[model samples]
Target: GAMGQETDWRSTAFRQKLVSQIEDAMRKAGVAHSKSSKDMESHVFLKAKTRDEYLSLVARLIIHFRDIHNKKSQASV
Candidate 1:
């Protein structure tokens, strides 16, 4: 059952698109050299046991970016 569920998420187009978008964003931000998209995916999957967990992780990532931007803005003030 775990394998089946994992396969389902891995094969989903939406998940692939989300990963691709994240990778592109990181590249645009000049962080692609820090870690490859495949490495990020592996790390994320290692921490996320399910699709919902992965989505939660992605949400946290968005929050982290927001935090960094906010800090930068504050520093510029």
Candidate 2:
């Protein structure tokens, strides 16, 4: 088989949750958005060329925001 397999990672729930979290983290980190989630999702999620690339997109977001989440936790204590 020469054809490649395609997979979709986009979901109403998942996109909303991820966007919300990114927004919150950015705000807390004092970062301004040059682009909206809708725009970023188009490139990051919709334009994913492979399964591994899609997974990496999600993983990168989580890892990048981990520090912000930790800061919030420490602030709450």
Candidate 3:
């Protein structure tokens, strides 16, 4: 093969990567993460009632927000 086949993402941090890739939006993401606790403790961030839910759900939310901002940015122009 002309290029070596390797999984380059052996170790990575989305917190660091996304913060650099997206700044202000990333800041809001951080805010929502910490602030949402009080408002939804006896509730669900859409039924997030487990550790996996809390962990993976935020990933989904972050991804959801990325697309959401993209739509607005394009709409703004």
- The best-first sequence of candidates by lDDT reads 1, 2, 3
Say which candidate scores most in TM-score. Answer: 1
Instruction: Please provide, for model 3 over 1-77, each residue's C-alpha lDDT reduced to its tens digit, 9 standing for 90 to 100.
Output: 32264333222342234234344454554434444433332233336655456446555555655665556553211
lDDT, model 2, position 38: 56
Q: Cα lDDT for residue 27, model 1?
A: 55
Name every residue pair that clashes in candidate 2.
none
> What TM-score goes with each of the models?
0.57, 0.49, 0.33
The digit string of per-residue lDDT tens for model 1 on 1-77 reads: 22333446656574776677666655554432446766776678678888788878866664554554555553211
**Candidate 2 accuracy as lDDT:** 0.57
Q: Per-residue lDDT for 1-77 in model 2, tens only?
A: 52243443455665666666656655665544468655655567665666577557855765565664556553321
Best of the two (2, 3) by lDDT:
2
Q: What is the C-alpha lDDT of each candidate?
A: 0.61, 0.57, 0.43
Deviation from native of the Cα of residue 8 in model 3, angstroms: 29
Q: What does the lDDT come to for candidate 1?
A: 0.61
- Candidate 2 to truth, TM: 0.49
Misplaced by over 4 Å in model 3 are 1-46, 72-77
The numbered model that scores best in lDDT is 1
- What alpha-carbon RMSD in Å does predicted model 3 have with respect to the real structure? 9.6
